[PDB]
Each structure stands twice: as structure tokens, then as C-alpha cells.
């Protein structure tokens, strides 16, 4: 119950919510990328993602295909 799994950016990034696997959100897609997935697609970890502005954050998610 609750908690998401850990898939790569291919199962997720490709189309809309219909593309992501079970237990995946279209808004917070970076959270479903494993430690390497979030570090490969965004090129940064969650500790750095928290210190982001907002203009870069959105351009970071819109970069691969989330925002």
C-alpha cells in the first residue's frame, strides 16, 4: 500500500500517464527514476534538486519529458 517502485526513464518518459508503469505520476516523474535514473536524466541528485530555483527545476523536468 502506498510507496512507488523504481523504473528507468524509458518505462516512464515516452508518452503521458498511460506510458509510465503502475504507481507512477506524470507530474513527479523524476521521483520514479532510480538513484541513477534521477542522476542521469537530471544530472543531479535530490539533495541538489531541493536547492533548485523553479525556472531550472521545470526546465529539468521538461528536458527529458515530465513537465
UniProtKB/Swiss-Prot annotation:
Residue segments, region Absolutely required for activity: 61-64
Q: Please give the tissue specificity annotation from the record for this chain.
A: Specifically expressed in epithelial cells. Component of brush border microvilli.
Cysteines paired by S-S bonds: none
Q: Where in the cell is it found?
A: Cytoplasm, Cytoskeleton; Cell projection, Microvillus; Cell projection, Lamellipodium; Cell projection, Ruffle
Domain HP stretches:
1-67
> In what way is this protein post-translationally modified?
Phosphorylated on tyrosine residues. The unphosphorylated form increases the initial rate of actin-nucleating activity, whereas the tyrosine-phosphorylated form inhibits actin-nucleating activity, enhances actin-bundling activity and enhances actin-severing activity by reducing high Ca(2+) requirements. The tyrosine-phosphorylated form does not regulate actin-capping activity.
Q: Segment Headpiece: which positions?
A: 1-67
> Which protein family is named in the record?
Belongs to the villin/gelsolin family.
Q: What does this protein do?
A: Epithelial cell-specific Ca(2+)-regulated actin-modifying protein that modulates the reorganization of microvillar actin filaments. Plays a role in the actin nucleation, actin filament bundle assembly, actin filament capping and severing. Binds phosphatidylinositol 4,5-bisphosphate (PIP2) and lysophosphatidic acid (LPA); binds LPA with higher affinity than PIP2. Binding to LPA increases its phosphorylation by SRC and inhibits all actin-modifying activities. Binding to PIP2 inhibits actin-capping and -severing activities but enhances actin-bundling activity.
Domain comment? Consists of a large core fragment in the N-terminal portion and a small headpiece (HP) in the C-terminal portion. The core fragment is necessary for both actin-nucleating and -severing activities, whereas the HP binds F-actin strongly in both the presence and absence of calcium and is necessary in actin-bundling activity. The Gelsolin-like 1 repeat is necessary for the actin-capping activity. The entire core fragment is necessary for the actin-severing activity.
> Quaternary structure per UniProt?
Monomer. Homodimer. Associates with F-actin; the association with F-actin is inhibited by tropomyosin.
Listed name of the protein:
Villin-1
Q: Which source organism? A: Gallus gallus (Chicken)
Instruction: Give the stretch of the parent protein shown, with its full length.
Output: 760 to 826 of 826
Amino acid at each position: 500500500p502506498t510507496k512507488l517502485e523504481t523504473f528507468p526513464l524509458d518505462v516512464l518518459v515516452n508518452t503521458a500517464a498511460e506510458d509510465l508503469p503502475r504507481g507512477v505520476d506524470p507530474s513527479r516523474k523524476e521521483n520514479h527514476l532510480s538513484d541513477e535514473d534521477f542522476k542521469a536524466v537530471f544530472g543531479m541528485t535530490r539533495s541538489a534538486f531541493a536547492n533548485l530555483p523553479l525556472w531550472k527545476q521545470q526546465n529539468l523536468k521538461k528536458e527529458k519529458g515530465l513537465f
